[PDB]
Amino acid sequence: KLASIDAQLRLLVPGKVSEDDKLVEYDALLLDKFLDILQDLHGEDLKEAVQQCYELSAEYEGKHDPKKLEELGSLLTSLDTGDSIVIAKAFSHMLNLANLAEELQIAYRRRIKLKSGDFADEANATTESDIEETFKRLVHKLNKSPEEVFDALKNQTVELVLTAHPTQSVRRSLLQKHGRIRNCLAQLYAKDITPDDKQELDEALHREIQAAFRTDEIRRTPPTPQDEMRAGMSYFHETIWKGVPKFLRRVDTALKNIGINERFPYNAPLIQFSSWMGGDRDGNPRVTPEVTRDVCLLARMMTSNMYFSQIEDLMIEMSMWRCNSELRVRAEELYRTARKDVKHYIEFWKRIPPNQPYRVILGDVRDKLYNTRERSRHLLVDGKSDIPDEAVYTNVEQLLEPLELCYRSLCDCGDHVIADGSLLDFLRQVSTFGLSLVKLDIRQESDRHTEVLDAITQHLGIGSYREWSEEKRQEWLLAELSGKRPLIGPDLPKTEEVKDCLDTFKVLAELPSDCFGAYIISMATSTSDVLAVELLQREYHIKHPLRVVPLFEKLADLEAAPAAMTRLFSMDWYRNRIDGKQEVMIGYSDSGKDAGRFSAAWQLYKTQEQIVKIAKEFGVKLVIFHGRGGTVGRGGGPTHLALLSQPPDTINGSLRVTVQGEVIEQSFGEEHLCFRTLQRFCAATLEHGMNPPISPRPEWRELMDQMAVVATEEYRSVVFKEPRFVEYFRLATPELEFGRKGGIESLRAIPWIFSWTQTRFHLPVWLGFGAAFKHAIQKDSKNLQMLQEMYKTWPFFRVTIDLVEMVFAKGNPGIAALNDKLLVSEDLRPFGESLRANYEETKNYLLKIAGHKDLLEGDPYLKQGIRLRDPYITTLNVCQAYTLKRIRDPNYHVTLRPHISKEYAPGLEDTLILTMKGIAAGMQNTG
Amino acid sequence: KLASIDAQLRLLVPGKVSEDDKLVEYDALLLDKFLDILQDLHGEDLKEAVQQCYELSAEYEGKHDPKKLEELGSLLTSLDTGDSIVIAKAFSHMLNLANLAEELQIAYRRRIKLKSGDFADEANATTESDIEETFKRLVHKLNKSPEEVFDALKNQTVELVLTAHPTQSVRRSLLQKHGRIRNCLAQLYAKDITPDDKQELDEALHREIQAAFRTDEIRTPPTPQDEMRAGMSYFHETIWKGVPKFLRRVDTALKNIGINERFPYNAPLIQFSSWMGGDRDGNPRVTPEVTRDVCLLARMMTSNMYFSQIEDLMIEMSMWRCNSELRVRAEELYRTARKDVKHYIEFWKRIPPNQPYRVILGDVRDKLYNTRERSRHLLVDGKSDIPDEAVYTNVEQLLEPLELCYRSLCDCGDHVIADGSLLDFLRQVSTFGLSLVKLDIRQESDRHTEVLDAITQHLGIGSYREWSEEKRQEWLLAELSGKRPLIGPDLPKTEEVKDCLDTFKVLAELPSDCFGAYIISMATSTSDVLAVELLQREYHIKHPLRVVPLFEKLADLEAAPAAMTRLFSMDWYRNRIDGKQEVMIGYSDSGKDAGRFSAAWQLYKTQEQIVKIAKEFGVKLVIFHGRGGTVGRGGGPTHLALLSQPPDTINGSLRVTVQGEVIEQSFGEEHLCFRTLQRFCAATLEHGMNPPISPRPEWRELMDQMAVVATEEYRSVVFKEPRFVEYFRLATPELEFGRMNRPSKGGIESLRAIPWIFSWTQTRFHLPVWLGFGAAFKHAIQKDSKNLQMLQEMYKTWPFFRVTIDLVEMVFAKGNPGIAALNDKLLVSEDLRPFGESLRANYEETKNYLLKIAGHKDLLEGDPYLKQGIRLRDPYITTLNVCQAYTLKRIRDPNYHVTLRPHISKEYGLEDTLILTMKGIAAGMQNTG
């Protein structure tokens, strides 16, 4: 049964099993129970077919014999649509189980007691510094006083911006099933388990696996953006909402342990969450002003609902009858004006007596939270509400105030100790999540603002903004930014795009400012791009204009950014507007699509240095907002070192980073990982501003510059100049099929990365590194040693290589070869072959530079997790390849096996969507 | 209370206590029991005094408040002779207990599961590569086949040469008490202990601690024969059994890399040797008779050890199935068999022929017994009627019947049984032979010159001593092919000359398997080596010992390459050495001449240069490592030290000194013994296939520049300051070490390296180890600020530099300039105090540059387990340093009076206290330079 499955799994991953290494055991137990379920639901025959696919794939992952892929292919292409769907569902579900098991292993893996002190320790969760160890290094090694460390942390802000799962927003219900599977699993391994508890936990585990597997409706319609946002907010309930105060309490403990005798102030804004879900409309016209309004109200509804749903518990605890005057007076006020009758609440449904004074205060907070929640709900569903302003909270201060009053009163009556329990936790939740637990960024591309302004200029009869030079655009924008009359009259002609863009500003002017964060400009190139958005916000008389944040994407745009920023910072109107602060966004995957990932990485390092210097010179504080695709978006320990690798002064007390949708599950799904994620963000941010990495040696810059010219040239000659690259890309990847659910340049970065990730080839991540390495080594043999010294000694270089190496570990060029054979026409097959030759050569240079014989010999726990997933992913790759063939070629047919599954009109496109989601869930983050 | 003692001890060593860290607990429990014993034996009052000394010292080691040293001084200087002795005995004893506890902690400390692969992992026992990990790295990272690894190990030799404890050879009896204390302690922490077992182990622990404490007789120095026998105790305690346990681990590791045979039982992978009774350099008590006696003692012990385990093997070898070959031999022995009682413990009647293996092994036992008794009669009576064919005279004769037993088992289907105790016994025989240590002789070059000068002058042909090096060579080569003997019966001989000649006579008379190398101390020249070769020829020694120069001073090291080249160019010599040469280096020796920094670097270069010269002449070179190097540290640091050696300087043959003050740590506890053998074997194997990086040219250049400056600073202080010697005699117990004995001392230059290192170790100042590093670092950094980074990169990246700094850093951690200051104040005359002060200023500056180069804020932040061990011993050593300081004042200064407390101890001068403090301080400091 179990032992035999353990046996097969163990062959896949040799390693040195101590007591805390249970990952293979976990996976065996889950696969075993899932196979019983499949047999039950679908029959022994189907179960055996799954087992056979698994076996062939595991054998292929052993020796990589192409024959095993062919057999696997023969089996899978012989299945009818019904059986295909069951098999893709099965293998997708096994990937999710394996991920949950891995999360449990990471959570309980033992910490290394004596850390070597090298920066490399910060790349691995077993060795990284926790917040206290970070405090102690800063005190003992950098000679900071405890007070200086405390004071910097109090002024620090970490902002985490959640973006949508590129493929599969996981619904709340299923998430909760996944959590209970993970728990049953952990409890099965609890010390001293009685046999009956074990028997019952076992049957509970079986049941939860099945419930999750059978949560599988294939819903005709794409998910609406409102549903995608709500799905994307599920992690707050599952872990983050409680996780924040647990981490802030660990900060209190750590402070205490370095001799600071106060708690971290409950209202220091150390942690802030934001979102792009319903705010980013770049290249996405489904994101309408109505969508943006709805996700603001949803965020407000959920936030007030989360406070409301925990206030009764706090009321129960706050039974104390000793209070100070201030609160006594307020309680007697509320008590006198108090309703004689039933409130339809679970717990305190009769009038609260005045000898329960804290309950009287908190009872009023509950009524306000309830009304705040209901208003938002009526605004969403009915389009408005008769609930008035003084019945709800419109600012966070109104909510904090009575809580602070409870706190002071307890402190004044001798009960400080009690105040620092749930009350303190609640205060911290209010201060972190406010009235909208995420602030929403708006994003739209620069050309849309140009178009809007052009419609205005031409209607005014003064010419065409689009025809104007950069100087003229600046001049006219600054004149109108101090203009005395509005720009927009009621008969301005508006195309649908122009209207859609203006109406977004209208929503911004109408909704409360605490709903919003930054206004990000995609494809920004110039000063005027930023002033353009400033003028539209001024025209709509927005009381608190959103800060305007350019996103410079292409290499050329990155090179022009410094002069653009310098010109902004020189303009009095703008300096006055921004009040000493500017945020700029970089997009790793964006820049990498333009120039190759190697050159984007190096150019982004340089551009950040240059912008930081320009900000200093102008006395402006700069925040760099990290978009997706960087070493800082990996999650887990690698994020810790990535943060510490940043160029000096680029953090300076304020971190803003994207948490990519495909990473959210690993970062925040399990509560220990959620805690350790918050911790490494806060610790690294703190450390970096007081302990910058080494700046590179001049020889290293020069070689980096030389390598970038070559990397870019290789990347661009393959991707942009080879006239048949596009055609090869459309055949070898599922790119076209993903898109229906101006070349690569007008293809967006997520489909670019995603399409090549699906085939296990990952061209967007590594292409260009090979030529860079080879050219450097061949120009001068000494460069091999220089590169190895950079890997060992230069944190930027180290993390940049490690991310590529992880992506190689998820790669398998045999999958791409099978796709070439099935999908690509014969005359392009040599092209596909030469790319595979570049992959191999590039991987081998990287290995040589890293000093590794094998992929990830640095990080065997990460390699182990990747290897355990591989057979499942491989089965899905093969299923997908033959599915694409059938879909593309209505005359491709094979003899079909009699239907295998029992029960007791889905098509090919349904099977495809299942493979694509499962493969993406197994690959998680790459480029 | 136990808990209160735990509390005090815990304050001394903050750290991050997981379950395997019990060292503080062990020390508390031992101190608590020893205190009960003191109260019992000597009264509550004396117990309270000891406690109070301990408390004051522990507080002082916490915050280093001078006030605590003063109070400790006031208390100790108020004690009479009788109480002083009890106190010094008490604190010495506690140091031994602490060392035993630390051993147990190192033995059970958890291994790190995932090693980073950096060479720095090989400096630490928790991270170093075991023999299998070593095999795997060679296979998977250096692309050796399993067969190539197996073949290199089969041809490898590791030879460990045991030297005398410089201060206190520990007697067998006490050693065994220490072992039992260590076991009681381990068993008290066994998982699932019943309360009665715990109560009984407790009482056993108490009893052993007392037995060891009361083994404390204080008149005569120990004879060199008794020192050798003391020095051999570790074979019985651990090494005898440890060797086959390690060789069986090699079998297991081989199997795990796909080699399906055992390591051959007769591959000479491990060899032990000795200097005890063989080294007479500066020591006229080591006579020819001494040397003869230690050879016979080694023979007696070895045959006794085989004898004392043969009956056990006979009992097991009950099997009745044997092959023809053994059957025939058994029936032979059975027919010629004695009808009557043998006075043995087990097989006292005639052995029947259906027990064939017993018949074979019965005859081996008789031979072993006779071999042992011959040696004993030769020692006690001066000769023996026991004839040659009644005993084993060659090891082959003992192997043969054991091999026959092995084959017969294999042939009858019992290979598996053969590979049990029989295999272990075969390995013991192959490793220890008929003399478990081979003895090196050592004598200084000038003695040979003196002997040959007597000969030339008696012959009327002039004076060898006056002759130039060229003329010496010419005459030596003529006589090395001479046709008549040199020495006539009327040669006039001074006692020294006679003593040196008669040593050669002992070498000619005894079996050659008793001996290893003839080491020449103070070697400088080709003729020095030929001189010894001529004397061996003159005595017609059938198997002459190989002649091994020890080049000591810097100038001698610089002249070594030309000396070796000349030797290797001479046909007579090439023919004599048959493709092999051994050369010795002495780290402490060279460091006394030129400062340790320059000696280290010069020794790196000289080894490189001699290796190259050997290759050119097609000679295999062995470098014999004398005391004081990073390779003499023991424990993990030894592993990285060995790997740090210049390329090709091991080449399959390691020969290193195991210093007497390190033997207890290396071999006393069976797990450490096993690990010691393992790291010597693993590192030696690895190095020949995986040399460290060779240094960058910039690094060599800076090393050269730094050496010039280091040597200059070391020599201006030690040799050019006209009052350094007078200061040294006041600030250290150097003179008293002399007049309470080897002999010890023409200034520092004629002072021997051990008394030099020892004297400054005693004051916790350690000048010999660090002096010169300071000027080297400062000059480098001030000449170019960039050198700081270069030096840090060398530390991080160049194993030689890393290990060289780590040893100095360990020594600073054992230092305390408060103790040296106290000695200055008590013992040094006022006009020399500024000198002492300026040395303390150099100490501080040198420490800080070292810390900066190593990237450490605090001493040993690299190695917290080592720091912890040193810190827990400090309070005991400090109490002894203070006691010693005031004792030396009283001994030296008839003016000094203090009011003495009424006698404290019950039951039921000064020189004795001093010897106790000197030995206890040395036992707590262990190895430094």
Alpha helices of B570-654 — where are they, by DSSP H? 571-577, 587-594, 596-616, 636-644
Contacts of B790 in chain A (CB under 8 A): none
Quote the CA–CA distance of B621 and B652 in Å, as a whole number: 10
Q: How far apart are CA B281 and CA A87, in angstroms?
A: 85
The conformation of residue A768, written as its DSSP 8-state character, comes to T
Q: For helices B596-616 and B799-813, what crossing angle results, to 10°? A: 150
The per-residue DSSP string of A95-145 comes to: HHHHHHHHHHHHHHPPPPSS----GGGGGSTTTS--HHHHHHHHHHHS---
| CA-CA-CA-CA dihedral for B367, B373, B374, B380, to nearest 10 | 170
**Biggest alpha carbon distance in chain A?**
89
Helix (H) or strand (E) holding B242: helix B240-256
CB A876 within 8 A of CB A91: yes
The whole-angstrom separation of Cα B423 and Cα B265 is 7
Which secondary-structure segment (H or E) carries A370? helix A357-381
Q: Give residues with Cβ within 8 angstroms of B335, minimum separation 6.
A: none
Q: Is residue A29 a contact partner of residue A188, using CB atoms and an 8 Å limit? A: yes
State how far Cα B694 lies from the chain centre.
29
Report helix angle A325-336 to A396-412, nearest 10.
120
Q: For B676, how many CA atoms within 13 A lie in the half-sphere containing its CB?
A: 29
Angle (CA) A85 A87 A89, round 5°: 65
The CA distance from B38 to B213, in Å, is: 10
Report the run of H or E that residue A205 belongs to, with start and end. helix A195-213
Query: Cβ separation of B113 and A853 shorter than 8 Å?
Result: no
Contact B393, B307 (CB under 8 A): no
Contact B857 A141 (CB under 8 A): yes
Cβ contact, residue pair B116, A114, below 8 Å: no
Is B365 annotated as catalytic? Answer: no
| Whole-number Å distance between alpha carbons of B127 and B117 | 9
Closest residue by Cα to residue A163 from A288, A275, A285: A275
A140/B857 touch (CB, cutoff 8 Å), yes or no = yes
In chain A, residues with a C-beta closer than 8 Å to the C-beta of B114 are 16, 860
Residues of B in contact with A116 (CB under 8 A): 116, 120
C-alpha distance from residue A36 to each of A752, A869, B25, B133 (Å): 39, 20, 52, 42
- Is residue A621 classed as helix, strand or coil in its secondary structure? strand
Amino acid occupying residue A398: Q
Total H helices, total E strands in chain A? 42, 8
Q: Which residue has the tokens 């004695």?
A: B338
User: Nearest-CA neighbor of B709 among B816, B803, B782, B785?
Assistant: B782
Chain centroid to CA B802: how far? 22
Cβ contact A57:A94 at 8 Å: no
Q: Can you tell me whether residue A306 is helix, strand or coil?
A: helix
Report the distance separating Cα B791 and Cα B779, nearest Å. Answer: 12
Burial environment of residue B381 by CB neighbours within 10 A (0 to 12, 13 to 18, 19 or more):
exposed
* One-letter amino acid for residue B772 of the chain: G
Identify the CA nearest to B116 among candidates A784, A859, A457: A859
| Cβ contacts of B813 within 8 Å, gap of 6 or more | B859, B860, B866, B867, B870
* Cβ–Cβ below 8 Å for A113 and B140: no
Question: What residue spans of A460-553 are helical by DSSP H?
Answer: 470-481, 496-510, 527-539
Distance CA B798, CA B793 (A): 8
Q: What was the elucidation method?
A: X-ray
Whole-angstrom distance, CA of residue B759 vs CA of residue B787: 34
Contact, B262 vs B424, CB < 8 A?
A: no
Indicate if A593 belongs to the active site: yes
CA dihedral angle for residue A566, residue A567, residue A571, residue A576, rounded to 10 degrees: -40
User: Is B633 noted as a catalytic residue in this protein?
Assistant: yes
Residues of chain B contacting A16 with CB distance shorter than 8 Å: 113-114
Q: How far is CA A510 from CA A296, A319, A373, A544, A778, in A?
A: 11, 41, 18, 11, 62
* C-beta of residue A399 within 8 angstroms of C-beta of residue A393: yes
Q: What's the full length of chain A, in residues?
A: 927
Please say whether the beta carbons of A887 and A912 come within 8 A.
yes
**Amino acid letter, residue B730:** L
Q: Which is the catalytic residue, given B93, B367, B592, B766? A: B592
Instruction: For strands B438-444 and B515-521, give the pairing.
Output: parallel
Locate B347 and state its tokens.
């097989």
Judged by CB atoms closer than 8 Å, whether chains meet at B114 and A853 is answered as no
Distance CA A392, CA A371 (A): 6
**3-state percent breakdown (helix, strand, coil) of chain A, nearest 5:** 65, 5, 30
User: Can you tell me whether residue B579 is helix, strand or coil?
Assistant: coil
Nearest to A749, CA basis, from A731, A764, A734:
A764
In contact, A327 and A406? CB cutoff 8 Å: yes
3-state SS assignment for residue B158: strand
Is B113 within 8 Å of chain A by CB? Answer: yes
Q: Phi and psi of A280, rounded to 5°?
A: -85, 110
| B841 annotated as ligand-binding | no
Query: Can you give the three-state secondary structure of A540-582, one letter per residue?
Result: CCCCCCCCEEEEECCHHHHHHHHHHHHHHHHCHHHHHHHCCEE
DSSP state of B507: H
At A649 the three-state DSSP class reads coil
Distance CA A57, CA B736 (A): 80
Nearest CA-CA distance, residue A245 and chain B, Å: 27
A549 pairs with which residues across the strands?
A520
Q: How far apart are CA A94 and CA A87, in angstroms?
A: 11
Task: Give the three-state DSSP class for B355.
Answer: coil
The partner residues of B157 in beta bridges, in order of sequence, read B653
Contact A113 B141 (CB under 8 A): no
Q: Which of A33, A89, A137, A165 is catalytic?
A: A165
Beta bridge partners of residue B882, listed in sequence order: none
Sign of the alpha-carbon torsion through A338, A340, A342, A347: positive
* CB-CB contact of A881 with A823 (8 Å): yes
Rounded CA separation B759/B415 (Å):
57
Q: Which of B577, B535, B528 is nearest to B551 (CA)?
A: B528
Q: Please tell me which residue in B376, B633, B715, B802 is annotated as part of the active site.
A: B633
Residue B143 in contact with partner chain A when CB distance is under 8 A: no
Residue A730: partners with Cβ closer than 8 Å, 6 or more residues away: A736
Dist. CA B921–CA B736, nearest whole Å: 15
Q: Across the interface, which of A114, A120, A860 has its CB nearest the CB of B114?
A: A860
DSSP A625: E
List Cβ neighbours of A504 (8 Å cut-off, separation of 6 or more): A281, A289, A292, A442, A444
By C-alpha distance, the chain A residue nearest B864 is A114
Task: Concatenate the DSSP letters of all residues of A671-685 into one string.
Answer: HHHHHHHHHHHHHHH
Structure letter (DSSP) for residue B512: G
For A149, the token pair is 């460390």
In chain B, which among 805-864 make CB contacts under 8 A with chain A? 857, 864
Of B113, B120, B864, the CB nearest to A114: B864
- Residue A681 near residue A673 (C-beta atoms within 8 A): no
**Contact between chains at A116 and B116 (C-beta distance less than 8 A):** yes
User: And the tokens for B147?
Assistant: 């067969």
Task: Return the residues preceding each gap in chain B, C–N over 2.5 A, or none.
Answer: 218, 741, 745, 908
DSSP type of residue B719: I
What gap in Å lies between CA B373 and CA B259, rounded to an integer?
Answer: 43
Residue B185 — φ and ψ, nearest 5°? Answer: -60, -50
Q: Any binding-site annotation on A691? A: no
Which residues make beta-bridge pairs with A624? Answer: A584
Q: How far apart are CA B223 and CA B211, in angstroms?
A: 25
Q: For residues B33 and B823, give the distance between their C-alpha atoms in angstroms, rounded to a whole number.
A: 33
Instruction: Give the burial string for B73-105 (b: 16+ CB within 10 Å, else e).
Output: bebbbbbebebbbbbbbbbbbbbbbbbbbbbbb
Amino acid of residue B1:
K
Q: In Å, how far from its chain's centre is CA A288?
A: 23
Best mutation target among A19, A114, A792, A798 (most B Cβ atoms within 10 Å) is A114
Q: Residue with structure tokens 């033995």?
A: B107
Resolution (Å units): 2.2
Alpha carbon distance A98, A114 (integer Å): 31
Q: Distance between terminal CA atoms of chain A?
A: 39
Q: What is the DSSP string of A421-469?
A: THHHHHHHHHHHHTTSSSEEEEEEEHHHHHHHHHHHHHHTTS--GGGS-
Contact B580, B620 (CB under 8 A): yes
Question: How many residues are there in chain B?
Answer: 929
Residue type for position B507: L
Residue with tokens 């402490």: B588
Tell me, what amino acid is at A298? L
- Is residue B893 within 8 A of residue B632, CB to CB? The reply is no
| Rounded-to-integer distance, Cα B98 and Cα B100, Å | 5
Collapsing DSSP states into helix, strand and coil, what is residue B461?
coil
Cα(A834)–Cα(A821) distance, rounded to whole angstroms? 14
Asked whether the beta carbons of residue A114 and residue B141 sit closer than 8 angstroms, the reply is no
- Determine how many CB atoms are found less than 10 A away from the CB of residue A62: 12
Site of tokens 């010179």: A617
- What does A304-346 look like in DSSP terms, one character per residue? HHHHHHHHHHHHHH-------HHHHHHHHHHHHT---S----S
B304 is in an annotated binding site: no
Rg of chain B over all Cα atoms, to the nearest angstrom: 29
Across the interface, which of B16, B113, B864 has its CB nearest the CB of A16? B113
Interface check B16 vs A, CB under 8 A: yes
Largest CA distance in chain B: 89
B515-521 and A516-522 strand pairing:
unpaired
How many CB atoms are closer than 10 A to CB B492? 10
What residue in B sits closest to A126 (Cα-Cα)?
A: B114
A114 interface with B at CB cutoff 8 Å? yes
| CA atoms in the 13 A half-sphere facing the CB of B11 | 14
Residue closest to A283 by CA, chosen among A494, A523, A444: A444
